[PDB]
Symmetry: C3
Subunit: 596 residues, 3 copies
């Protein structure tokens, strides 16, 4: 008896009945204990004696054994105990070997990380992926990870070790071909990694989520070639109520918080600080095997960010056999600011970027039906390289409504460089243009339409304060075609502007071009007493359909025409009134209108 009770089967010979209930199951102590399971149950030497965790012990083989055993039982949750730091100090083996895998996740085996997991000095200067859900070296020959949840109040610490080379990959949790998997509550911190979490693989996966997780200082070296904290690469997956922070200078140039790469994915309720970018929202053709070649229903909403580059970078590219498409996106409720910095010191500040592909090609995209609404954007007044939308690649549609944009540019693209084809750009008049950059815009165009062409587009400029420093509210170079488009400049705060709307190739004369903007016109009248016509002295208003006065008449003996039309020769003509006769000569501020 004493032999049995002191042996490992001793709890299995001690009876128990729930709260002495006569109806309850007659069990043994071991049975109630077998309901839960922890790392302590596999953290032992060959002779079954428990090993204590610490900086001089590799917990990898033990945690792996635990995962492998519970995998056999059909599932369950392993606890990684609180009040202990569990150091990992070696590479995993078999299926995860090809992915630099430390621990292999398995279906139905959840990890409750309450304690801390720290990478040992073994992993300094080399690649690693701390948790991997692939069961094969080649991911195309891998099976799925299902129903695997990592959660708790625990920490995952990458040791603070730098990358050994730019080519190396480093990840916290690679769920792999992951269906119904999540990370909740976990702090990932102190490292130099490519991602902290990757969800899915080339579209394979579903219902994967990252929630209430923290991501702190996950870039620290100039070697690090790129970073995206959470990579969503399966559909019906997303990031929610998370926190992302960086302090590293290098992070401001390379780090993005989230990437959405498949349909029905989201990023919301999250706070970001110290990153270059908020989110990539893209279809990479090379990732279209699992969930097809379209990224639709892409949601970036109610996020808070202090970034140094671009907030949302839209993108779409092609392979030889597959073409990427992006459509039905929504960016709403976000309050974003470019952080304090020198002009041109980080990648170009923007709220929306229509970026080219990895290879720098700008003539492969298919971005359309994008709604940008109810967002707040601010950039410090000194930051020249700041824009509401940086439009550097072919755009098939994007709609801006009821946003608040307080930065240097509204619409922008560098002169030279790319020559984007633009369709269906809608800038509703409900977008407010802020005044922080007033007086800073010497020689610059508020909307600098540096494109190959613009069609089926609306730009309704409305100012809410003066900036007479800008060269124009909106400018089109002669190289930019314009047709079936609406371009207006509201007169408010524009009276003293020499240029409002500028069409360098006279593109506002287009048969289906709808424009209105203020201009200053010199008029001469005939000498006739009574009703008398006034004509403009310049002859470049052949495109004008109507014009009306925006200035007072300080004269008593006459009044120029309130409204005007044009003549074959490009003069404006109206009918004023001479109370007394005499040739009149005035300079008046007119709202020039064409088919509007």
């Amino acid at each position: 008896f004493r032999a049995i009770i002191e042996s490992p089967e001793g709890a299995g010979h001690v009876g128990y009945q729930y709260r002495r209930n006569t109806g309850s199951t007659m069990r043994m102590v071991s049975d109630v204990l077998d309901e839960r399971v922890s790392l302590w149950d596999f953290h032992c030497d060959p002779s079954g004696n428990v090993i204590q965790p610490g900086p001089n012990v590799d917990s990898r083989q033990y945690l792996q054994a635990a995962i492998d055993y519970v995998s056999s039982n059909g599932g369950g949750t392993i606890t990684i105990p609180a009040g202990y730091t569990w150091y990992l100090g070696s590479y995993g083996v078999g299926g995860i070997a090809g992915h630099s895998g430390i621990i292999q996740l398995r279906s139905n085996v959840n990890l409750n990380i309450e304690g801390r997991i720290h990478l040992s000095p073994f992993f300094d200067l080399k690649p690693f992926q701390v948790f991997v859900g692939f069961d094969n070296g080649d991911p195309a020959s891998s099976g799925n990870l299902e129903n695997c949840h990592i959660y708790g109040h625990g920490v995952v610490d990458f040791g603070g070790y730098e990358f050994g080379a730019s080519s190396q990959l480093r990840n916290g949790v690679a769920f792999g071909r992951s269906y119904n998997c999540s990370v909740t509550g976990i702090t990932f911190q102190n490292g130099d990694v490519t991602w902290a979490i990757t969800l899915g693989w080339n579209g394979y996966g579903s219902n994967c989520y990252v929630r209430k997780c923290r991501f702190i200082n996950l870039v620290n070296s100039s070697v690090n070639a790129n970073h995206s904290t959470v990579y969503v690469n399966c559909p019906y997956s997303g990031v929610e109520s998370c926190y992302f922070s960086m302090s590293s200078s290098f992070a401001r140039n390379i780090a993005c918080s989230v990437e959405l790469h498949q349909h029905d994915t989201f990023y919301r309720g999250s706070t970001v600080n110290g990153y270059c970018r908020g989110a990539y929202v893209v279809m990479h053709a090379a990732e279209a095997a699992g969930a097809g070649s379209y990224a639709y229903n892409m949601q970036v909403e109610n996020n808070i960010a202090v970034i140094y580059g671009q907030f949302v970078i839209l993108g779409s590219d092609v392979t030889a056999t597959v073409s990427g498409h992006l459509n039905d996106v929504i960016v709403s409720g976000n309050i974003v600011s470019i952080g304090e910095r020198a002009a041109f010191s980080a990648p170009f500040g923007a709220f929306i970027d229509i970026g080219p592909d990895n290879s720098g090609a700008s003539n492969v995209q298919d971005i359309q039906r994008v709604l940008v609404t109810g967002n707040s954007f601010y950039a410090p007044a000194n930051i020249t390289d700041s824009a509401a939308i940086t439009l550097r690649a072919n755009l098939n549609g994007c709609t801006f409504i009821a946003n608040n944009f307080d930065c240097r540019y509204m619409v922008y693209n560098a002169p030279g460089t790319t020559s984007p084809v633009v369709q269906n750009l809608v800038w509703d008049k409900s977008n407010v243009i802020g005044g922080t950059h007033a007086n800073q815009r010497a020689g610059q165009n508020l909307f600098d339409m540096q494109f190959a062409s613009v069609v089926n587009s609306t730009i309704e400029v409305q100012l809410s304060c003066e900036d007479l420093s800008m060269f124009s509210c909106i400018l089109f170079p002669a190289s930019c075609q314009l047709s079936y488009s609406k371009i207006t400049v509201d007169s408010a705060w524009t009276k003293s502007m020499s240029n409002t709307a500028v069409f360098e190739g006279n593109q506002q004369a287009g048969a289906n071009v709808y424009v209105s903007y203020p201009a200053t016109v010199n008029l001469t009248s005939y000498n006739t007493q009574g009703a008398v016509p006034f004509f403009s002295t310049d002859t470049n208003y052949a495109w004008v359909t109507s014009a009306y006065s925006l200035s007072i008449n300080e004269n008593l003996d006459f009044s120029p025409p309130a409204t005007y039309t044009n003549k074959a020769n490009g003069q404006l003509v109206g009918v004023g009134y001479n109370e007394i006769g005499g040739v009149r000569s005035v300079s008046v501020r007119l709202m020039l209108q064409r088919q509007v």
Copy 2:
């Protein structure tokens, strides 16, 4: 001693003190074990021996006993163990009998479902409600369920069995008259049911929530008469960060993801696929006993959906003694699309539907103060039956601002059928009208105002591309009264349209009707040299207050009037200018304005 230790009281005679702390309580092993509790503690035969779960065992009596026992202790959480499937194979008894109840929930007894719960072939072809919080057959004679939470990573599987008859009801969790109850993390799957979760009962209840739950393939038969995945029927209750998916053809015609039926309820952060409808937002007078006769503070926000019918269906009906009212609703941030399908193959595609009551009556509603803002809606170009708002019943107010609507119709109602009375419909100009359906609108009206009357309403039409296929941007039949309303068509992309705004009963002549729209007018001038009047040849502009040119003057020897007013006889009249005398005859595009 050995007798005691091996018996069921053996753990109660084995001492324990937390981590050998001298200050800790001296307890027995049983006591620490009595803190937690699982299904294993009640899953036994009469002789106390544990029964193993499986497809040939009914776990119902055991789970019920567990719930009944913990209910007596005052509360606690029962675990349904992971790595086991717990098959249910019989009806429950007593209070839940009248509700086809399987398991009876009780106050303060939470169910941690980590394992799987599967319905046995017993329940094929008959009704069931797997969890019921009613304690009585008649729900009006039932007490409350309080502080009852069902959560975990577990699955609830309905077996995939079809309904036996349309009359049958099937539910996953009927919380009943439920206060502080929730379902979190649970996957409900593989079935044919009326609802998966019902919260509250006719307004009785509070603080009930469904979060992070998954709902997969819960309709599979033509017998199934109706489905709504989550039914919210108590105030201060809602659905949050959930996932709803269907593959069944039948689901596209009958299935709705959520219904909000009482005040202060919400649906947000959720993804829907394969449903007919997103949400019903309604006051049913028959459900007004618990929380009164008003549904106010109704929030549908930040959801993603691919549906085949209507996204949000607003509704309000009456009984002999009670009348339903709906007001103070908000629909924001949602990105919805009608899924790929043939025209007219599922219920009419719409973003907002103002539906009639169950009985088809359209003259009982009281829907007002509804805000629809910052949403994205898309329907494939072939889908004729798609609309921003389908307005088929009496409407007392709905406000559209800064939405993106890319579908066949903006405002729509079938000609014939109903004759809705419409008050306070506000379509702000900040709503963008998409171009996907351009060229598809032969013989159709973009805003087809098929109503009995329209009052205190605003329709500010703004196009962002051409569609000359449409018959009109907006049309009112002579049967539709119009008063104290504003109806405008912006000129952008409208130059080549024969009809822009059409008032078939000349309703734009109304004393308090404010309209502006483009039209083509033929004018003849007198021969007088100098200032010379032009008059329209048609005499139907007696309602016009002002008009101005939208076209150029290609002539040199004269210029028609820039602006016009009218005469008693319905002619337009302006003052142009003959440089040389002669009778002039022109056809000009005018913006016709009335009191605007």
Copy 3:
């Protein structure tokens, strides 16, 4: 053996091996039990015998001991058992003494409150703070609370006891200088307190959150001087998916649900009922030590509320050495209503309030770059004291876009009282003005611009129904300066209004003032046949740049001018047309325009 097994070390001599796995660690029963920990392990008398909880026992010393012990082990989670009420009946000691502290929180020690915690009659009429994370009397000399999480389905009950005096402070959870701390799932109820949760202290702290918590009846006495349910006073912290309810009359006058006092803080997804206020969003200079003197990235979004005072109260104040600043705020998606009540019976109803400081000073603020968009606001028609924005202090910027405001006033400030300096107030035309208060506005101005000055501001008034009861759509007293501003009144529903826009000091004549509004003008023409001028009989249109007809011409023999300009003497002048000669005299509705 029997001696050992029955003693407290008995579980430590009973062997166990996880599920009889030969690879699993050979442990003792005690070891598996030592993984979890509860209040039962410290809830005993000096002799180690367990004490049962109840209304005649003080659980404070026992819970404290438990917290102190687990603090030593490095961390872990203590459970407060379900099915038991744990009464607290004494003050804590040492570091928390100066804060009226009951229990002292410590780093890494989480409290799983599943049971109920009730304050005993000891605490009636005196102050208390049930949980305190300060370790010192003076908070400036306190260390941090880190990684401390309070969660579960449990209740925290304040006993229902009233305050003994207004000076007393009462709190549920004072996290103190708190980093990575949270309260989740907990119901705080039945009391009279200053706050339920306070996060951070004067800016020190990070990543603190309140989620899924309930707050019910936490004010009940006229003694209670103030209440804010959750006070966020550290950065990167926020409230999410919470519920706040009051029934007390006193709560409607003093209670606010949330306060955001540091940068990157949020309040969203929450429901509020019975409060005076929704949220304070403020920088108090006195709280600028920890996180600096700027509150930026302040997010109030997707909340539901029935309040009786102000929804969001913006604020900013100064000390002798520090000045507060507030900027980059966003208020979106909220649906708020003033609850049913008598006019002037609670603090002034408003959606946004720009309040003065505590000391009533209105000339210290620095509020700018605030976006208010996509919100719904309603106030019962009888409530005179209701406004979209109550602007009672100096404002440096606030932008309103695409909101739905259905209340008595749009912009308001009491005449007399304060004289706010206003810059950058942008009221976009996409804001809808509701009609619930139509006919109630006798002698009142819809926008009552009672300010010292207004500059760089936009007010685009758009009505959607008639209200001829109002004195004006917008009024500026002669004391209010106006410059570099845009003020427009759309003509829709305004035809029968005697006053539309009123400038009592003729401020619309300002050189950079851009206005348009309807007015009624009397005109007389000369007798000349043919083209003939009409002049206004009044001479106060010297500021007018253009004007156009808003009324029909019922005459046949002549037509007045469609458009007009002005003369040096302040007359309007246009060119009409006399078909037959004769002096004409008409009264016409004109849209008066200035530089627009």
